[PDB]
Amino acid sequence: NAMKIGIIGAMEQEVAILKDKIEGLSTVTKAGCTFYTGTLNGADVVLLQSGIGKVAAAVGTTLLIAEHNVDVVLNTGSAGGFDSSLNLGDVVISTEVRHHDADVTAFGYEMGQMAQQPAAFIADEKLITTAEQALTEMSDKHAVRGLICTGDVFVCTPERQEFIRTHFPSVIAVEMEASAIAQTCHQFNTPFVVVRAISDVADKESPMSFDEFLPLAAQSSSEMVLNMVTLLK
Amino acid sequence: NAMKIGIIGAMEQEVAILKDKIEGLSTVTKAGCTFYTGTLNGADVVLLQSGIGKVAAAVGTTLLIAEHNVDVVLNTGSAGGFDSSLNLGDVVISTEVRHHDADVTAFGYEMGQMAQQPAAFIADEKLITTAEQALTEMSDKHAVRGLICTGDVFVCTPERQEFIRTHFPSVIAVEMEASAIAQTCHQFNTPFVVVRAISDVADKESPMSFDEFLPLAAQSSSEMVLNMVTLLK
Ligand SMILES: Nc1ncnc2cc[nH]c12
Ligand SMILES: Nc1ncnc2cc[nH]c12
Ligand SMILES: [Ca+2]
Ligand SMILES: [Ca+2]
Ligand SMILES: [Ca+2]
Numbered sequence: 001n002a003m004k005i006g007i008i009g010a011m012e013q014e015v016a017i018l019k020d021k022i023e024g025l026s027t028v029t030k031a032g033c034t035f036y037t038g039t040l041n042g043a044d045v046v047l048l049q050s051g052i053g054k055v056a057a058a059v060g061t062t063l064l065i066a067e068h069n070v071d072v073v074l075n076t077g078s079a080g081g082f083d084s085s086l087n088l089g090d091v092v093i094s095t096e097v098r099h100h101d102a103d104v105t106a107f108g109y110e111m112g113q114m115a116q117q118p119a120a121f122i123a124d125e126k127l128i129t130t131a132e133q134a135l136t137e138m139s140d141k142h143a144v145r146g147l148i149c150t151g152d153v154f155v156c157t158p159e160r161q162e163f164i165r166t167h168f169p170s171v172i173a174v175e176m177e178a179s180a181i182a183q184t185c186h187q188f189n190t191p192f193v194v195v196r197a198i199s200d201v202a203d204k205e206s207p208m209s210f211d212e213f214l215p216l217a218a219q220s221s222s223e224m225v226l227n228m229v230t231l232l233k
Numbered sequence: 234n235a236m237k238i239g240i241i242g243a244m245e246q247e248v249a250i251l252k253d254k255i256e257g258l259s260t261v262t263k264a265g266c267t268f269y270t271g272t273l274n275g276a277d278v279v280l281l282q283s284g285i286g287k288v289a290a291a292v293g294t295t296l297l298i299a300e301h302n303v304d305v306v307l308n309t310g311s312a313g314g315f316d317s318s319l320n321l322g323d324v325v326i327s328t329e330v331r332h333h334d335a336d337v338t339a340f341g342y343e344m345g346q347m348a349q350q351p352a353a354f355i356a357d358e359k360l361i362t363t364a365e366q367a368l369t370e371m372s373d374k375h376a377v378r379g380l381i382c383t384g385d386v387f388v389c390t391p392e393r394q395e396f397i398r399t400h401f402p403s404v405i406a407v408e409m410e411a412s413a414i415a416q417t418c419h420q421f422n423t424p425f426v427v428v429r430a431i432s433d434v435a436d437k438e439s440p441m442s443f444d445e446f447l448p449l450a451a452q453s454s455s456e457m458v459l460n461m462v463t464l465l466k
């Protein structure tokens with residue numbers, strides 16, 4: 001018996017680096033998802049390319065846990081930076097994750113809290129400790145640990161930035177899958193962590209420059225995840 | 234072999250009427266979802282209580298299709314009315330569904346279209362025909378057929394109604410799961426239809442009157458689904 005490590009990225013570029021390192025690779029496709037199973041430095045992994053956004057991530061995470069038998073989930077890829085200390089390419093590690101675009105305050109929930117869910121999804125303590133160790137193995141890579149907020153939006157306006165900061169002042173980064181991954185993992189009682197890297201600062205120029213910085217972000221976040229899975233073997 | 238009809242409702246009250254009609258019932262729970270399997274007037278059904286919101290609906294729909302082997306999906310329950318002809322308790326039938334809260338327009342997608350997804354999810358022609366025949370079997374029940382818009386929000390402010398109407402002028406009703414169910418069905422190439430009923434008109438009065446009319450909405454939409462399953466079996 002060994003841990004089975006799920007790794008989730010949304011986009012082809014976010015998974016390709018890790019894909020090509022897997023040994024004893026097998027491939028499955030289902031519901032628009034691709035699953036690459038094998039070993040990464042002797043760790044048993046299942047690497048999922050989910051697609052973008054909350055529903056795609058939830059579909060894929062569900063399959064990853066229910067059909068691919070993973071024990072923990074690591075979410076890799078790019079994110080939009082909100083913490084002022086971040087630079088492009090820097091790592092972000094989730095302490096917790098929230099939906100920035102959920103509002104059932106009608107019924108007394110706090111902003112971001114989905115009905116019947118906790119207000120925040122707490123990343124696993126052991127996986128955070130593993131992420132810290134993984135970061136030390138990189139060459140002078142800066143990270144920030146903190147709240148990651150997700151919505152079905154690529155944030156690129158000052159108005160949407162101000163809404164998010166009004167309700168989630170501690171937010172360090174935004175993206176489009178983490179809270180779906182985290183919620184699904186909560187429903188399945190599965191440990192998770194998000195270890196992404198910054199592609200942009202979620203401003204008006206960001207949609208145009210995303211593509212130029214995605215390779216950097218994918219490289220950083222992939223190097224984190226490779227170091228983590230090796231630590232977990 | 235017979236068609237296996239999946240039926241999805243978010244809340245206990247949305248599934249309770251149908252649950253008690255099932256014959257040869259068996260129950261299982263997974264990931265915060267409850268699945269009620271048996272027959273409804275001789276049709277093979279799997280009735281899912283998913284939970285509220287897009288992620289919960291996606292998790293449940295994924296299990297319903299992948300693990301419970303359903304061939305079609307009917308989404309039941311309550312919705313907030315937008316079309317001016319709708320009264321409390323009236324039925325809404327989806328022609329198509331969109332995410333009202335998705336925005337990746339800066340990458341060229343249209344409003345509401347998720348990246349890597351079609352702009353709208355089209356309800357199945359045969360299931361819509363069946364819904365129309367079910368509606369005729371009711372005693373003088375008014376319905377509107379049209380676009381249903383989903384988001385992770387219980388809509389109850391004029392500002393949010395105005396945003397939705399600005400971007401989706403043909404919307405007939407809003408709710409919190411349909412686009413997740415429909416996207417998941419798209420990904421699984423599974424037919425779907427939404428056949429909900431009106432609990433409120435998505436205004437400032439709607440948070441505190443929802444509960445009074447949820448039983449009415451559950452009654453109408455359950456009667457539609459029961460009529461449909463008899464026809465589809
Ligand atoms: N600005 C942004 N908004 C949402 N997701 C991402 C992912 C990278 N940049 C982002
Ligand atoms: N006003 C509303 N907004 C979202 N979903 C529902 C479901 C019933 N009424 C609704
Ligand atoms: Ca062992
Ligand atoms: Ca290789
Ligand atoms: Ca560019």
Ligand SMILES: [Cl-]
Pocket residue numbers: 011012013014
């Ligand atoms: Cl890509």
Ligand SMILES: [Cl-]
Pocket residue numbers: 143144145146
């Ligand atoms: Cl920090």
Ligand SMILES: [Cl-]
Pocket residue numbers: 244245246247
């Ligand atoms: Cl209920």
Ligand SMILES: [Cl-]
Pocket residue numbers: 114284285286287288289290
């Ligand atoms: Cl949800």
Ligand SMILES: [Cl-]
Pocket residue numbers: 376377378379
């Ligand atoms: Cl009509």
